[PDB]
Each structure stands twice: as C-alpha cells, then as structure tokens.
Design a protein around this ligand. Structure first.
Ligand SMILES: Cc1nc(C)c([C@H](C)NC(=O)C(C)C)s1
Ligand SMILES: [Cl-]
Ligand SMILES: [Zn+2]
Ligand SMILES: [Zn+2]
Length: 573
C-alpha cells in the first residue's frame, strides 16, 4: 500500500496545501480515497451533413450528434485451480509470442516521431506535446522519473479519469519505452500470435473469419464480456508482468517498474461536481495507455479463451484445485495442440470469435466466470448461443458479406448498419476547425467508404458526392488497423491494390478498369443493412445530387474540383 503510492500522494498534497480537505461524504467504496482539493462535446461536420440530406429526418442518425458505477466495483479472487491454469497458460503464451520476436526499448527518437504524426497517446509549462518533446527541460523531468523507477520508486506517474486514463507525457514516454515493443514490433500480428489481428485491417477481418469457419468443429462463439477493463484481476496483471521474464539489462528493470508502480498500484484524479478533485488509488482493473491496453487485453483474452477451450475438451475436471497429473495434462495439451487451438480464434483486445472443437464449449463456464470474465446480456450459467454461419458473426462492430464479382472472383467485405456509418461521418471532435479542415475530414470518411463500403449503394453515391464537393488536391485529415483511405492517390488505384494486387485470398490478379466492374450487395440485402434505396427522399437526393455538390462548392469557393459522379452508371449519360 502507502509505501509505493504515498510518494505520488505526498507531492499532490503540497501543490494544493491551501485546499487539502477530506470530504467525509466521499462516494468511493472499492476505490481507496486519500483526499480532495479545489478545481474548476460532439460537433456536426457541415460538409458531410449537407451531402446526406435524406438522413436529416432519421433519428438513429440525428440523435448520435446530441448530448461510472462499473469502475467502482470489486472482482473476487479466483480459486487455486483457476490461478494455476492461468499461470501455466500465460507462461506458455509469452514463450510462444517470444519465439520469433525480441523484446527491446522504444526510443525518444521513436516517441518524438509519433507525437509529430498526431498519434493518440492520451496525454494531459508546455501547450502541446510537440513543444515538450522539443524542450530538453521535459527530457530532464523524464530522466528524474526514469532514475526513480530504476530505484523502484515513483513520483509523477498519476492517472486522470474522464473510460480513458490520461497521464503526463513523461509517464506515457516511460510506458512507451518499456512496453511499446508489443505494438511497434507487432507481437499480436496474426502471423506471430495465430489468434491476433493487430495490423490486419477491416478488408482482411472477413477473410480471417471465413478461414476460421473452414476448421472442423462446433458453432462460432462471440461472447462479449461486461466491462472487460473493470474485470482485470490482480492475478491477470501478474500473468501479464511475466513478459519481463524474457527481457534483460535496463529494459527488464524499466518494464518491472511500469508493471509494479503504475499498473499493479495506481493513483488517479477524478472531478466530482459537489467542483473538487479526488485522489483515489486501487491495485486491480486496467488503467494504461490505450495501445498497451490493446496488447495486454489481447494477451489475457487469448489466455482466457484457451482455458475455456480446455474446459470444454475435459482437460481438467474442476477449478477448485488442479492435481499434479492435471498440471502435466494442461502443459501437454498446450505443447501438443495449443497452436492449433489459437488458430481457431480471432481476438482483438476484449473482442473474440472462437470456433471450438465441438459445442461442449457453450456450457464450459466455470473457469470463465471464476476468472471474472462474466458474459454480457445472458445469465451467468445459461449456455452461450453460437453462430452457424460466419457471415452472421459479429466482430469489431461489423459483420461480413461474401460478394461475387461479375467476373466470378470473390470479395469478403465489411458491413454494419448504415445509420451508424452516416451518423459517425457527420460528427467532428474539438474546436477551431476551419472550413478547409472540416472538408478534409469529410473527404477522409468519403475515401474510407469507397474502399471498405463501396458495396452499399448510398455510401458509394455519397462518397462520390463528397469527393466531387471537396477540392481534388486537398489532403484528407484526421485530427491495429490500416488506413489506405488517407491519401491523395486515385481511389480506383488504391481499390485495385487493396482488394486485388495485395489480397492473399485473390489468385487472379487481373486489375479492375472501372468502378462499374465493382459489385454492390443484393438490393434487398442493402435495405436489410439500412439502405434508403426505394424511398422517395433517397430518389430525389440521388437525382438532384449535382445541386448539393454545387451548394458545398459555392461555400468553399473558387477552387479546383473534379466531377466523380460519372464513375457511376446512372450519371453516365
Ligand atoms: C473502418 C475504419 N477503420 C479505422 C481504423 C478508422 C478510423 C478510426 N477512422 C477514420 O479513419 C475516419 C476519420 C475516416 S475507420
Ligand atoms: Cl447463425
Ligand atoms: Zn513513475
Ligand atoms: Zn451488412
């Protein structure tokens, strides 16, 4: 307790010596409260909304632009049988992930190149992080903490709640220096991890789920966890920490300090309106950078799902206690079939799809519930409902269609309800957007649609309209996945590269010569997934689209524009 966190708490105490009041009516039960002190939205993208008029009267779209008791919860300690299963599996999984990779420190140079590329780090003297990385004074502050961690102590690595846990750039750098390698060197790539999809891209995920469907076995299971980050136990944090067993030198010590001082023993500042700032501590639950969070969520999810698979195959009888011979059976299962069982999964942080050996998996719930990974929207002991068709499985907020081109070649495409896509593209975050910056964000959404959602009639039409309304040479902007749409290259050339040339599931590499060779879903299947095709509002929009494009061109002014509407058959004469 207070020996590891007290030094951080002491320093905050003094900075607000005038206001250090202990509010006896503090709402925390699970969080350990220390003291208080005195302290004191989604905007619409006008370019995308003017070019999607029919959606102005659809509440699922228009409500998206308008407008905890899970963090303050406790998770019971797992049984001894469960703790053994997790330790054996985690030991085995780090070794497997480490067979073709070498842990290493990430550099100030690498960090500095990420801040100048507008990468989301979650950071709180210096206005922006760019100024701080340029100032040696910042690196002087980083050095002091760096030497504190080598000494096994912490002073400034404190979380700020808002769920997102922002920290000071110095603590974020020290996290990146010690654990950035997991993402920077692609540990959770499909090639390395077999279950992972880090770096894949939305265009790949459907092909990956269809490859899992090809395995002999039972239903496809896709159970969501209720509040995954809140269910991470101190036992889970200990199993994650075993990556340090593969390290050496300074790196081993720096990594051991991140896990010990900032992950397994936290300090957090939360704003309570009654406005004051509360300084609370807790050892369990997930509270890290979003990028390290992603890789450790993937690791711990892979572990939990291999154990659920062991339970269904009868590898162990009870979570109460593993016998000596069950330990050897579990290790032997992992050595003999572990890699095959990893390939039966697609795991993206807390999100999973599993095609187990058979449907015994559906009712194998004792280890999953005892690890604290309780399923969302089903009773604790009711068996999981599986999917019989890979095209119906949810994964990473999508489902996937099999779409046959006029020339016979097969595309596997990502999809989701079209109201969600249009509603998201109509929102921008933050202040001080120029008309040009707003336009360039609309262009990013439009190019994303031409590449990923070209098969949805409304989105190919709206994408063509937005690209016709925004000056041809303006560069799309965006104030685990691949962003091929962020470019000024011709979108037909990018489509050919992504879906044909670089597609490992497409044997015939014949280029497509025009957008009219590129198919849509069935009219009925487009309506099922939210198309307005068939409505009078939509027909009038499509027919009069040049009027909408011209409205937006008149607002932006006398710039160079291209007409992309004749790429579609109906505007081709
Ligand atoms: C299908 C998508 N994949 C990723 C990674 C997206 C990002 C977050 N969003 C964007 O690039 C928008 C500004 C268009 S959308
Ligand atoms: Cl189904
Ligand atoms: Zn620290
Ligand atoms: Zn669909």
């Amino acid at each position: 307790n207070l020996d590891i966190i007290g030094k951080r708490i002491e320093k905050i105490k003094q900075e607000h010596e005038t206001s250090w009041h202990y509010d006896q009516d503090h709402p925390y039960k699970t969080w350990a409260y220390h003291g208080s002190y005195e302290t004191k939205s989604s905007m619409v993208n006008g370019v995308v909304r003017l070019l999607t008029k029919p959606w102005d009267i659809i509440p699922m779209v228009t409500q998206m632009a308008m407008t905890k008791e899970k963090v303050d919860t406790r998770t019971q300690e797992p049984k001894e049988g469960t703790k053994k299963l997790m330790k054996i599996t985690a030991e085995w999984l780090w070794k497997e992930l480490g067979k073709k990779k070498t842990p290493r420190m990430c550099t100030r140079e690498e960090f500095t190149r990420k801040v100048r590329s507008n990468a989301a780090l979650g950071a709180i003297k210096w206005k922006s992080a760019r100024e701080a990385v340029e100032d040696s004074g910042f690196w002087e502050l980083v050095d002091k903490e760096r030497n504190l961690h080598l000494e096994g102590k912490c002073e400034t690595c404190v979380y700020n709640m808002m769920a997102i846990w922002y920290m000071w750039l110095g603590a974020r750098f020290l996290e990146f220096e010690a654990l950035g390698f997991l993402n920077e060197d692609h540990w959770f790539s499909r090639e390395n991890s077999l279950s992972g999809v880090e770096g894949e891209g939305l265009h790949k995920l459907g092909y990956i789920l269809r490859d899992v469907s090809k395995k002999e076995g039972g239903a496809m299971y896709a159970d969501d966890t209720a509040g995954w980050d809140t269910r991470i136990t101190l036992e889970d944090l200990k199993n994650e920490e075993m990556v340090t067993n593969h390290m050496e030198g300074e790196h081993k010590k720096l990594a051991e300090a991140i896990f010990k001082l900032t992950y397994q023993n936290k300090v957090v500042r939360v704003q309570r309106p009654t406005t004051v700032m509360d300084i609370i501590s807790r050892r369990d639950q997930r509270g890290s950078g979003q990028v390290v969070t992603y890789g450790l969520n993937t690791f711990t999810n892979m572990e939990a799902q291999l154990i659920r698979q062991m339970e269904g195959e009868g590898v162990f009888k009870s979570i109460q206690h593993l016998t000596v011979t069950e330990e050897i059976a579990v290790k032997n299962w992992l050595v003999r079939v572990g890699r095959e069982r990893l390939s039966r999964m697609a795991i993206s942080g807390d999100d999973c799809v599993v095609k187990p050996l058979d449907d015994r998996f559906a009712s194998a719930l004792t280890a999953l519930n005892d690890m604290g990974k309780v399923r969302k929207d089903i009773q604790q002991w009711e068996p999981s409902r599986g999917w019989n068709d890979w095209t119906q499985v949810p994964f990473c907020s999508h489902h996937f269609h099999e779409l046959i081109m006029k020339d016979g070649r097969v595309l596997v495409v990502p999809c989701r309800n079209q109201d969600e896509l249009i509603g998201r593209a109509r929102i921008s975050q933050g202040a001080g957007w120029s008309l040009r910056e707003t336009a360039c964000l609309g262009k990013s959404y439009a190019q994303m649609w031409s590449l990923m959602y070209f098969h949805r009639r409304d989105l190919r039409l709206a994408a063509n309209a937005i690209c016709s309304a925004v000056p041809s040479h303006w560069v799309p902007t965006s104030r685990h996945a691949t962003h091929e749409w962020m470019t000024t290259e011709d979108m037909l050339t990018v489509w050919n590269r992504v879906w044909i040339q670089e597609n490992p599931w497409m044997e015939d590499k014949t280029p497509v010569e025009s957008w009219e060779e590129i198919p849509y879903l069935g009219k009925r299947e487009d309506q099922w997934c939210g198309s307005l095709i068939g409505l009078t509002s939509r027909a009038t929009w499509a027919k009069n689209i040049q009027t909408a494009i011209n409205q937006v061109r008149s607002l932006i002014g006398n710039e160079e524009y291209t007409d992309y509407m004749p790429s579609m058959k109906r505007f081709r004469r």
